[PDB]
Every structure is written in C-alpha cells, then in structure tokens.
Design a protein around this ligand. Structure first.
Ligand SMILES: O=c1ncn(Cc2c(F)cc(F)cc2F)c2ccc(Oc3cccc(-c4ccccn4)c3C(F)(F)F)cc12
Ligand SMILES: [Mg+2]
Ligand SMILES: [Mg+2]
Length: 560
C-alpha cells in the first residue's frame, strides 16, 4: 500500500520558524561561515513528502519466517510490567507538547486532576475501542545542519496526543526497555555506552579470521515499515507475559495507532493518511530495531554471508562477518541488498564492503584509535564533527530546549574535536555568564536528562576512563577529517583554541571546587606541564546505568 496519502492540506508550522543562524557575538568565536548553518523549516515539507511517499513491495520467505520464530521464542521468556498512571506521568518530559484537552506536561508531572483524569479516560477507551483510528499530528521538524556541496528537506514527525502518549508508556515502557535486549542480546546497540559499543565492534572485528563489514543505509526506513511489519512486531510483544489490560492496550494501539491513521497539521486540518511507521511513538525505536534486525538476519542467510554479526540501533545497521574473498564478498553484499529489498528495505546508497573498521560508519559514527599518556593505543568512538559543530553554533546564538553540544561532549569526550572545540568554547561561555552549576537538559539515545556541567569530569571518567583526558596522537584519517571540517566551517586554527583553553583552564582552577576539577582534567591538553590525572572520587560513586539501556528516540521519554 501507499506509505502515505495526502489530502492536499499543507504541513503547517506551529509558529515563526528560523532558518538562518542569527549573528550573535558568541557564535563567531566558534565558526565564521555562519551562512553555511541552517535550520530546516516546514517550507521544505513538500520536498520531503514526495520522498517518503511511495508504494511498498514486500515478499516474505522461509528465512524471514525462521528468524521471526527464533525472535519470538526468545521474547517468550520476557515478563512485562504494567506501569501506573503515576510512574508513566513521571516519565513525561516537562516540555512535551501539551494536550489538546486542557493540560500539558507540567500538569501531567504534577499528577494534576485534569491531566490524570483524561489519561484515565484515554486508557479506558484503549481497552474498549479496538478499532477507531487515533488522531495524530504531523509537523516538519526543525534541525540544524551545515550546507553540503544543497540543503536537506525537513524531516516529518508524527505523534499522538499527550493523553495517548502517557498510555503508551503505561502499556509498553517496560517492554520496549527490556524486550529488544532479550531478543537480540549483544546485537542491541542501545545497551552500550560509546566505550562499550567500540568494545563490541572491536571484539567482534578481531574474532574474525578475515573480517569484512558494511553499514546498511535503508532509504527512509520508517516509510518502508509495512502494516505487516508492525503486526509482526506486535506478535513479538504478545509473546511477553502481560497483564490483560496491557495486552489489550498493545493490540488496540497496534490497530488504531501504530499501523497508521489520519494525519492532522497544526491548523487542525486533515492532511492525509499514514500506512507506515510514525516517528513520534514509544515503539518507534524498539520497533525499527526489531524490524531491522529481523530483516537483516534473514537477508544474511539468504545472501549466504558467512558468520554475520549484527549491531542494530533503530533503523541503523552495521554487519560484521567472515570474508570469503573480495569478489565473493561484493556478490554476497548485492545478494543481501536484494533480500533486503524483497523484505521492503531498499538501500539509500548501495552498501560497500569495508576491510578497515575505521572506515565503517554506523550510527553516524566510527571507531578510531589514539594513544594515552603511556603511549598505548586506545580505541574510542568518533564522528564527523560538521553537524555537532553547526548545531553548537546554533545553540550558542539561540536558547534551545535540548543541548546537543552537551550531549556531544558526553558521548564524544575522547574525540579531538570535542575536547578542543566544544569544551573550550562552552566552558568559556559558561564562565562569562557565571553558569557552571546550572543543570542543562540533553539527550542520550533519544531520552532526556538534566546534567550539571561541573559533573563532566566524573561522567567522562566513568563512561570513558581517564584516558579520555590524555589521548593524543590521533590517526591521520581522523586528523584530516577534523581539519578539513574545521576549515570548511571557518573555525579558528589550533593555536587560537589552545590559547583560549589555557585561559579558560586558568580561570577555572582559580575557583577550586568542582570548577577546578574541570580545569585540571578537561583542559590538561593545553599546558606543557601535564598533570598526573588520578581517579576522581565522585566518578566511582556514579550510576550511569539508565543512560544506556534502550532507545527512546521519538518516544517522548524523560529520565528524572
Ligand atoms: O594528533 C594529535 N595529538 C595531539 N594533539 C594535541 C591536542 C589534544 F591531544 C587534544 C585536544 F583537545 C587538543 C589538542 F590540541 C593534536 C592537535 C591537533 C591535531 O590536528 C590538527 C593539526 C593542525 C591543525 C588543526 C586544525 C585546527 C583548527 C582548524 C584547522 N586545523 C588540527 C585539528 F583540526 F585539530 F585536527 C592533531 C593532534
Ligand atoms: Mg547497559
Ligand atoms: Mg534511513
């Protein structure tokens, strides 16, 4: 069927939308080429719609079915807990889109009578009405990018009302947080922290006689997800031991919301109909991961690839297997893409066999190596800094709900560009505004957390280890990329940053407290007189577990 059907009504903005980076005295320190930074707007919606709209082709086979049963069998071991209206409400981000029923995020978190009561009525309805399609809202998402040799059309987000959202949590939060793991084990990418992911990729890579791996980019994954896929997805959830209410709610949500439903723009006008995956629902991350793993694992058997190892992150896939030779590999890969196309997962860019792990890009990032104080190699996860930087500039010129810059300092603390550009630039700004202890909200694997900037040394040591503060001698390839990128965006030369770092470090130390620990550990690269960085107390007294359990991107989750 058609992934989409449009009435003709326009995907309307919900207010004034900014596309150009505003000129702020602070933005220029980071990059001078501000006209290269742009935020997507609803004005490009039409372009997007044309690309995500199309008829799907899906042919299932014996391999698909075999793998499915293997996954169901494992799911069978799971027992899911129904969440209480209270627990579910506490998971709602304080800035989630208000309900069209006289209550918003605050009320929900404040267990407000109106909020709690509508949510109850919504839940009741999910238990009685097993058919009526639930209304969803469609918006053009605003995201910042750097123009590439033209621009990207806004992505489209579809989500149900706040009421519905809380009910989703009630019925599926425990499932989407534990099932993926139970079904895919070490293949579930969200169980890993950046360091653990690298560990998994390197271990998996060395365990091969002659390793070969590729990244498989699926063309607009969400729109390739079919009614069948989503029902196969539910069949897996139905294998869990569930409370009657939770079970009915999963069945009703599947038929009324997940398989598709009406689309309404911000003006309350009917826009069309969705017959594929919505981006703004709780099962998006879990469902795409399950669906992508199922298809790839089956495709691999079909393509006769040898000893495949999947690493799935929603719609993101990276496969590492036993090479059977250059030609054979190239052929098995094409066979794999065809198996995937039949399964309704056509490729965006054709996949390419990689024989060098650093060249494989998965989850918009790759594995690279540098050296610690001792001089021993240390592997870390990095990525092209273009978007992180572009956004960092946007987040400097304007106040923003989430802070990608902070989320990036955390996930990419070991990286050359994160330590030289982001830490320097942002700490220097925080001092200028006397706001080091002010908690900031940022997202890790889609879920929001409030983090105090001054706890960055502990966090980093905990997730990455002390080497993150001493890494040097990066790879030629990594150095080249960062350099090319920094020059492209017009970012101050190395020398300009070292000077700014020496100054920020000094300013920080002369404050003691947690602000001093930041100066010693984070900017230890600036000074010639290195420091014997020892373990940090607060670092061991940390529990960053919830951080890397599952994916919730689009699920509207917030961890208090
Ligand atoms: O391999 C290294 N090993 C150590 N350091 C020192 C260093 C660090 F260990 C960590 C930092 F947090 C900042 C640092 F200093 C490097 C510093 C820069 C560099 O690469 C260069 C070299 C010359 C210019 C530029 C450069 C800088 C800005 C714009 C254009 N080119 C770069 C860079 F983008 F960073 F990749 C490579 C290395
Ligand atoms: Mg974990
Ligand atoms: Mg895609």
């Amino acid at each position: 069927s058609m992934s989409y059907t449009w009435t003709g009504a326009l995907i309307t903005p919900c207010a004034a939308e900014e596309s150009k980076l505003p000129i702020n005295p602070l933005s220029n320190s980071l990059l001078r080429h501000h006209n290269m930074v742009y935020a997507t707007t609803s004005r490009s919606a039409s372009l997007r719609q044309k690309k995500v709209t199309f008829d799907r082709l899906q042919v299932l086979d014996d391999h698909y079915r075999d793998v499915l049963k293997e996954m169901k069998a494992k799911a069978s071991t799971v027992k899911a807990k129904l969440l209480s209206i209270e627990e579910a409400c506490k998971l709602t981000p304080p800035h989630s889109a208000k309900s069209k029923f006289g209550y918003g995020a605050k009320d929900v978190r404040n267990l407000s009578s109106r909020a709690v009561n509508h949510i109850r009525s919504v839940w009741e309805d999910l238990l009685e009405d097993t058919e009526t399609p639930i209304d969803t809202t469609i918006m053009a998402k605003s995201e910042v990018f750097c123009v590439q040799p033209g621009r990207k059309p806004a992505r489209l987000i579809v989500f149900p009302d706040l009421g519905v959202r809380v009910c989703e949590k009630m019925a599926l939060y425990d499932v989407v947080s534990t099932l993926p793991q139970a079904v895919m084990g070490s293949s579930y990418g969200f169980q890993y922290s950046p360091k653990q992911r690298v560990e998994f990729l390197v271990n998996t890579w060395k365990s091969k006689k002659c390793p070969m791996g590729f990244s498989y980019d699926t063309r607009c994954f969400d729109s390739t997800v079919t009614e069948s896929d989503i029902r196969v997805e539910e069949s897996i959830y139905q294998c869990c031991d569930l409370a009657p209410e939770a079970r009915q709610a999963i069945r009703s949500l599947t038929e009324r919301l997940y398989i598709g439903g009406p689309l309404t723009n911000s003006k309350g006008q009917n826009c069309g109909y969705r017959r594929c995956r919505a981006s703004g629902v709780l099962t998006t991350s879990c469902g795409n991961t399950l669906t992508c793993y199922l298809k790839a694992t089956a495709a691999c058997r079909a393509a006769k690839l040898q000893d495949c190892t999947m690493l799935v992150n929603g719609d993101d896939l990276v496969v590492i297997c036993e090479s059977a030779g250059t030609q054979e590999d190239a052929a098995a890969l094409r066979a794999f893409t065809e198996a995937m196309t039949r399964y309704s997962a056509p490729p965006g860019d054709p996949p390419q066999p990689e024989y060098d792990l650093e060249l494989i890009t998965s989850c918009s990032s790759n594995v690279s190596v540098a050296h610690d104080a001792s001089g021993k190699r240390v592997y870390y996860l990095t990525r092209d800094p273009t978007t992180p930087l572009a956004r960092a500039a946007w987040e400097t010129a304007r106040h923003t709900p989430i802070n990608s810059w902070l989320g990036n300092i955390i996930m990419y603390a070991p990286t050359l560009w994160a330590r030289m550009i982001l830490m320097t630039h942002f700490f220097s700004i925080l001092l200028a505004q006397e706001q080091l202890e002010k908690a900031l909200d940022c997202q890790i694997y889609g879920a929001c957390y409030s983090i105090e900037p001054l706890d960055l040394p502990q966090i980093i040591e905990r997730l990455h280890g002390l080497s993150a503060f001493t890494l040097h001698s990066y790879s030629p390839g990594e150095i080249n990329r960062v350099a090319s990128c920094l020059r492209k965006l017009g970012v101050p030369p190395l020398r300009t940053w070292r000077h700014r770092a020496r100054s920020v470090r000094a300013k920080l130390l002369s404050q003691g407290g947690r602000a001093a620990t930041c100066g010693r550990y984070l900017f230890n690269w600036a000074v010639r007189t290195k420091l014997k960085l020892t373990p940090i107390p607060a670092a061991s007294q940390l529990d960053l577990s919830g951080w890397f359990v599952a994916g919730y991107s689009g699920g509207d989750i917030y961890h208090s």
